[PDB]
Amino acid sequence: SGFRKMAFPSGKVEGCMVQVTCGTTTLNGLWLDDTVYCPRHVICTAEDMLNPNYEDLLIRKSNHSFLVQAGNVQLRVIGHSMQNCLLRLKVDTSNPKTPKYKFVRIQPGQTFSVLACYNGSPSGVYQCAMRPNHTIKGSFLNGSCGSVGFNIDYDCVSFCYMHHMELPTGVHAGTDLEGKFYGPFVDRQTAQAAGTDTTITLNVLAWLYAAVINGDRWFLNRFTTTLNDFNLVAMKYNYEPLTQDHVDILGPLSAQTGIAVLDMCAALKELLQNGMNGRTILGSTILEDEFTPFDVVRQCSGVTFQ
Amino acid sequence: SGFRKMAFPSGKVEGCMVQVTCGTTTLNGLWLDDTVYCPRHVICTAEDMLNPNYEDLLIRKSNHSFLVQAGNVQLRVIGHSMQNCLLRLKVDTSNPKTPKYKFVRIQPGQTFSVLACYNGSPSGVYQCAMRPNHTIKGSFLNGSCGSVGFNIDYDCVSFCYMHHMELPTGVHAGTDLEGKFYGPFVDRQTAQAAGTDTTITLNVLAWLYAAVINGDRWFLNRFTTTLNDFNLVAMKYNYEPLTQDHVDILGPLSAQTGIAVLDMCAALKELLQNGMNGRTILGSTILEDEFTPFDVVRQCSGVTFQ
Ligand SMILES: *[C@@](O)(C(=O)NCc1ccccc1)[C@H](C[C@@H]1CCNC1=O)NC(=O)[C@H](Cc1ccccc1)NC(=O)/C=C/c1ccccc1
Numbered sequence: 001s002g003f004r005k006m007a008f009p010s011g012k013v014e015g016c017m018v019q020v021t022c023g024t025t026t027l028n029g030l031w032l033d034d035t036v037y038c039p040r041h042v043i044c045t046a047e048d049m050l051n052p053n054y055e056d057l058l059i060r061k062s063n064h065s066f067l068v069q070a071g072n073v074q075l076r077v078i079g080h081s082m083q084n085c086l087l088r089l090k091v092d093t094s095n096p097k098t099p100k101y102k103f104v105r106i107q108p109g110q111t112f113s114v115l116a117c118y119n120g121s122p123s124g125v126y127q128c129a130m131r132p133n134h135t136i137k138g139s140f141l142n143g144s145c146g147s148v149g150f151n152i153d154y155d156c157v158s159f160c161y162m163h164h165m166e167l168p169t170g171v172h173a174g175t176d177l178e179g180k181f182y183g184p185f186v187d188r189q190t191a192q193a194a195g196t197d198t199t200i201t202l203n204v205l206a207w208l209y210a211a212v213i214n215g216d217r218w219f220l221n222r223f224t225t226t227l228n229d230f231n232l233v234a235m236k237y238n239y240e241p242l243t244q245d246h247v248d249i250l251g252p253l254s255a256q257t258g259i260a261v262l263d264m265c266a267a268l269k270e271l272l273q274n275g276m277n278g279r280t281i282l283g284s285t286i287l288e289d290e291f292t293p294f295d296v297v298r299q300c301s302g303v304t305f306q
Numbered sequence: 307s308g309f310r311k312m313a314f315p316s317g318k319v320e321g322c323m324v325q326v327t328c329g330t331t332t333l334n335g336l337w338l339d340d341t342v343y344c345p346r347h348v349i350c351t352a353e354d355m356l357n358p359n360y361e362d363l364l365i366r367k368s369n370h371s372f373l374v375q376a377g378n379v380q381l382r383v384i385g386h387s388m389q390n391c392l393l394r395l396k397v398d399t400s401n402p403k404t405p406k407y408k409f410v411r412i413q414p415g416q417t418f419s420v421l422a423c424y425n426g427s428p429s430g431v432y433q434c435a436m437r438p439n440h441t442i443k444g445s446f447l448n449g450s451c452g453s454v455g456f457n458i459d460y461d462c463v464s465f466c467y468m469h470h471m472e473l474p475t476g477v478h479a480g481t482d483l484e485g486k487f488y489g490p491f492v493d494r495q496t497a498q499a500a501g502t503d504t505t506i507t508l509n510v511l512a513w514l515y516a517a518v519i520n521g522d523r524w525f526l527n528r529f530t531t532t533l534n535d536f537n538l539v540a541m542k543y544n545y546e547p548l549t550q551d552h553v554d555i556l557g558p559l560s561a562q563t564g565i566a567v568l569d570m571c572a573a574l575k576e577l578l579q580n581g582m583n584g585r586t587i588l589g590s591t592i593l594e595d596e597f598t599p600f601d602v603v604r605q606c607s608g609v610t611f612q
């Protein structure tokens with residue numbers, strides 16, 4: 001029993017973190033095989049960020065313009081290239097701790113674990129959703145750039161995020177491990193701001209299923225809803241519209257609990273209209289949207305407490 | 307910016323987890339140097355838990371009654387002894403991944419990271435407070451016994467918890483790495499239940515300091531309070547009484563923000579009496595008590611957003 005915001009175990013990723021310095025700028029990199037990946041802004045000063053031309057800034061560097069430290073060992077850089085908003089530094093040593101891995105671009109609403117790092121040293125691990133607005137509500141300070149987000153499936157690490165910047169509202173923006181930003185953000189000083197965000201409806205429903213698996217039914221009701229009538233309420237409450245593909249994804253949770261999706265929708269509608277009346281669900285007084293349907297199946301028992 | 311329930315990076319602990327089987331019972335162990343630690347109930351069946359005599363159950367085992375698997379390798383057991391509610395299995399191989407470590411008994415209100423494990427394989431990591439009632443609100447399923455809690459200071463792992471059981475309310479109980487239970491619980495079937503719990507007042511105040519460091523002051527007020535008048539309100543709201551030693555602990559946070567402790571107490575009093583009026587603090591609609599003063603200093607910037 002219990003339900004916690006759980007991260008994946010971080011050791012396979014810890015063994016990949018290094019420090020990258022160019023000039024007076026230092027941040028973290030990710031060392032897999034004989035490549036180090038890092039935010040391309042390592043080549044900039046604070047003034048350069050006001051209007052950087054990365055191609056022009058980079059051509060002025062050599063391989064020895066970059067210092068890479070892995071623990072206490074210096075790794076020699078023997079090649080460099082830009083890929084979108086990252087650099088790919090070739091190094092003289094292949095990482096012996098390289099796990100099985102791949103690069104994935106995750107989608108809005110999906111969750112991942114962040115290994116916060118400073119100076120190549122890991123400091124903490126936490127779980128994050130990718131918001132509909134393509135931000136994350138992280139916890140990052142100066143020096144955290146190049147910290148990575150990841151999921152683990154079997155013993156394969158799927159890297160999906162590298163940290164680049166904080167926006168004015170205090171939320172965080174970054175790239176996939178091809179260097180393509182999530183969202184419309186750019187690695188230069190602008191008036192950029194997080195777009196309006198939405199609640200991740202699919203996750204809310206998944207978390208209500210978790211609450212039933214773990215033995216609680218208080219918020220269920222005798223009603224049902226159409227998808228469309230449900231969406232009219234959703235729009236009023238700044239929830240994402242639910243689709244049939246979402247309904248299908250909730251199949252396995254629906255089956256485990258015996259509650260049809262649209263009957264769980266009607267329970268959510270009631271919760272939205274009436275509130276929770278001073279009650280909690282899985283310990284929370286609000287509706288939680290940072291657990292996906294897969295997160296619930298991973299964590300919860302496969303036997304409902306009936 | 308941001309503030310998240312952050313765990314320590316788990317790799318130093320992952321490299322220590324094994325599987326321990328005795329008879330038909332399988333659970334996890336912790337392998338440091340040439341010892342494996344595990345819950346002594348590995349020697350019991352379900353019927354034995356109704357009234358186990360551990361001394362009598364154990365004398366009937368040999369070394370080869372225990373099978374220890376570390377990844378895919380079998381480790382031979384060459385000695386065994388009971389220590390309180392754990393076994394200490396001696397093995398034929400010293401763990402080459404043994405970190406720098408120590409065993410600590412943590413105190414009520416202090417926080418730690420849990421590495422949930424099944425069959426010797428780590429599955430997730432999350433942060434937990436030790437409740438005043440000597441329980442943790444974890445997330446554990448069958449097979450998680452022997453999962454450990456820990457803190458990391460420099461590169462030293464301080465192990466403080468090993469998991470043994472779930473109580474009827476769904477919260478979790480266990481031991482330190484000497485095998486002494488936290489709280490009044492016993493490793494046998496009884497009518498045992500979690501005592502009434504309390505809110506961890508010191509942590510609430512620490513988290514209000516975090517909110518000021520991160521730039522928010524809405525809940526402050528022009529008033530001050532005596533310690534005693536503050537405690538009269540605390541008792542009415544099921545908060546732990548605040549003491550002078552708590553006040554002292556909050557010194558460094560008080561200084562960083564320029565808010566005296568007792569003036570922060572008066573802001574809490576007002577919050578308790580009046581509520582939060584539909585507002586949030588660090589994203590939360592409730593007062594959070596699972597971050598210690600040290601947790602706040604570790605995570606927050608050392609420069610207040612004034
Ligand atoms: C990274 O750690 C980092 O890159 N530091 C090095 C650096 C290089 C060149 C110029 C400036 C800095 C850092 C992480 C941030 C810092 C605070 N919280 C974190 O998440 N990233 C930055 O400092 C970036 C640099 C940048 C990237 C893309 C576009 C413009 C700038 N800037 C920001 O993150 C700005 C944050 C901010 C927050 C509040 C008020 C003003 C500015």
Ligand SMILES: *[C@@](O)(C(=O)NCc1ccccc1)[C@H](C[C@@H]1CCNC1=O)NC(=O)[C@H](Cc1ccccc1)NC(=O)/C=C/c1ccccc1
Pocket residue numbers: 001331332333347348350351352355446447448449450451470471472473474478492493494495496
């Ligand atoms: C452990 O994984 C475990 O030890 N499993 C092996 C075992 C050996 C011998 C007898 C029984 C089981 C497990 C972890 C629990 C299971 C569910 N969530 C977890 O945290 N621990 C238990 O199963 C213990 C065994 C026990 C220890 C101390 C005193 C009595 C029994 N029991 C419980 O945890 C009971 C839980 C429970 C929950 C709801 C309703 C009834 C019982």
